[PDB]
């Protein structure tokens, strides 16, 4: 039984982060979480590319441009979506998730999902560096593990 | 840490706008908002292409033709969908959003989402130049920022 | 401003684990979580000492014997306590936590708290490798960070 | 991975038992359970020291005198506390458990907890040789395992 | 099976009593009970030392001074605490019991608990020489038995 | 009547801060509050030592190491605890507070309590730089006053 | 980015305090709070001018006379208003606040607002040196910071 798995060392890995600007008060907590995870697992702060896009709808196209780069090992997508009073939330969330998944399959590169989809502001706050943890940290950890796994699988 | 972001200057950028004719009383408010945003951020009114399509279902194909043009930096899609008494609203909205997202990923060009999806006429009016702002203005601002970002990323 | 913090590399660190036997169906999930964390952060499986004690009441004395060893950098305490029908749960939990804290202060060595205190079996299952994570993994991560921090602070 | 654990053989081990006199109708069932466990696991009835104290408040000081003896491998504390109509139960139970835990940490010797803390007489009867087992038997089993474990760890 | 136990003869034993002054109408009934028990079990009224302290908070320090005396075989602590309208009762009771227990363990001398902790004046009266007995008598009996037990154990 | 009191000048005082990483979105607001208080009362930013520990359970041992340093005048402990669904909150909070108090008494050095213990996320947010103030600022002010008081009392 | 801010040192600053006589039982607590703040932040008790006016309606005119003095750096207004049974409270409070604000703008000198406006006596007591703090202390702290800020801005 051949077993493949990824270690949690970030030595020599290069990451891209695409972060939205809407709900920036929570998005920047998520971004700090992701960067802290990368640095404290042994990565270098100079191996991180950060792209800021105006809203969550624009994440897939910028992520596609970042992932088409040769010197990027994994891409981390970060955003916050909070349901309002219309179905706008439903359509935006479905499009963002579908776009990211299709892009990852097409380019054969890891793209981790770090987007919060909350019904209320209280849930959104809970998941951005509060009692339920930090989604940016989780997404960065997943990206590190997948980059190492793909390196060993290649 | 390399950081990329877009400025909010519209100097020398060329935009396309695809606007639907259905619910024209609100659509033309959205269109005026978008054009005003472009002009007052320093763009030229002669660098704007406007395509009118009969309904919101037809937005993706016209937007595809506009985005395949070489001299268009970003495309702004504008329409109004109001839920009626049948599931027709659900299927139209899902198809429009999916089509726009897939087109943007395929052509690697920014296509901003300026379509209102409202349950009631009151919500639709609120979002078209009333207490909750103007969605056309927001879509134009997003298009300006993404055009500048893609210019700097290229 | 001098800033001290611990990295998340487990290279060259030696750990002790004290695990109770009561509720072993959940305790062994917690133990597997802790060992997996240590190994995948770069530690060696031969640098791990495992002590099994009959119940959670006996954790502090065994942990004291383990922490008095010269070649142990941090100790991880693991157990599961589920409230029954008497105040027995209250007194056991208070004694275990107080004993571990006093021992850590006396010996000036990190002793991380990986004991689940649940009101119901459902909560206990949720916290032992289910939707709310794995407490053993969290305790091991804390032990790694504190061992590195104490190394840098010394 | 070095693994330490205790066997369940009582050959050559010497035990002390401290038993309270209050609620003697249940305490003597607990004592019979403990002695039967020790004897049927291969111990000798002549290697057992039994101290009787008037009440549960007095268990820690007598247990301390017993555990300071050189030829005692583990001490088993046995008593029954049943909640009455005042907070007296709360303070007695907290003091007894805290005293036993501190004594065990100070002397570095196993002291197992065999004290029943019940809200009602029915629960107390259930736990003293009835449908829920015998707490004295459980405490003796824990003492045997810890004595063997400490022997192997030394 | 070596068996140790204390007889109920008070011949040649010297006792100290620490009694609080607050709630003196019940405290002096408790004191009379304790002294009567000692005398009618064969002790001498000249072998009794009585210390009066202003309140129940001060019992542990005076009891410590009494128990550090060489010619005192056991110390009896006596007081009455009745819950009022604030948490003051909770903190006083917890401190008194903890102090007495720690002192007894440190000095290796019997200190019996004869403090009434009642929710209502009716319970306090019941336990001070009324239908539920006399707590001072019970504490003195415990002290006699422990003094004899420690003599035989030495 | 000799009267001793501390001034609120931080000139020439050296402080240590121990801050937990859990709930970092609120902890870093508390840390900014404490540092701002120290600096604007006339202290130097180079006289501040900052230690980061993984969780609130680990605060006492790191605080002990910091307070055993000769050139530290006071230590400020900072963390956030929010009640969840289990008694875990109760035991963690009791251990942290008891450990800090015992450490301060043993080392005869001021250790101020800046840990938020909240039932809900709303209370926690209120006490971390919102309508009810900033607990880090309060803890730093207390540390300054006690350092000056101990200087004058020595 | 030029940044201006005030320190919290009161060295060499001269303050005026205008205090009303009505509700003097709470007003004198507020006054003691303000004076204590000034003195313990390094000010001199001889640099404080205190004016007593009969009621809160008279605060603005006396404050105007104090602030027209050349050797006064900031003025602290202190009073207590408690709603009665008529709209008298509404008109008095509106006039006092408006007068103080207009005076501060006209004279270009800091005048801090230390007047309690409470619906009930319980709220008034809470805000005058009880669980919610002391408003006089807060007003004095604000005056110190603004005096330093205006000094640095000049």
Residue numbers in the entry:
A (entry chain B), B (entry chain A), C (entry chain Q), D (entry chain F), E (entry chain x), F (entry chain b), ...: 1 to 154
What's in the article?
LS from the hyperthermophilic bacterium Aquifex aeolicus living in hot springs of up to 90°C is extremely thermostable with a 119.9°C melting temperature, which is ~27°C higher than that of the next thermostable LS from B. subtilis. LS catalyzes the formation of 6,7-dimethyl-8-ribityllumazine by condensation of 5-amino-6-(D-ribitylamino)uracil with 3,4-dihydroxy-2-butanone 4-phosphate. LS consists of 60 identical subunits that form a capsid of icosahedral 532 symmetry with an outer diameter of 154 Å and inner compartment diameter of 80 Å. Further processing and refinement resulted in a cryo-EM map at a global 2.33 Å resolution as depicted in the FSC plot. The RMSD of both structures is 0.174 Å for the 154 Cα atoms. The LS monomer is composed of a central four-stranded β-sheet flanked on one side by two α helices and on the other side by three α helices. There is a channel in the center of the pentamer formed by an α helix (α3) and its four symmetry-related neighbors, with a diameter of about 9 Å, where most of the amino acids inside the channel are hydrophilic. The residue R40L forms salt-bridges with residues D36L, E145x and a hydrogen bridge with residue G6x, while the residue R21F forms an ion-pair with E5x which itself interacts with R52F. The R108x residue interacts with R154x within the same chain and forms an ionic contact with E65m from another chain, while R68m forms a main-chain contact to the oxygen in G64m.
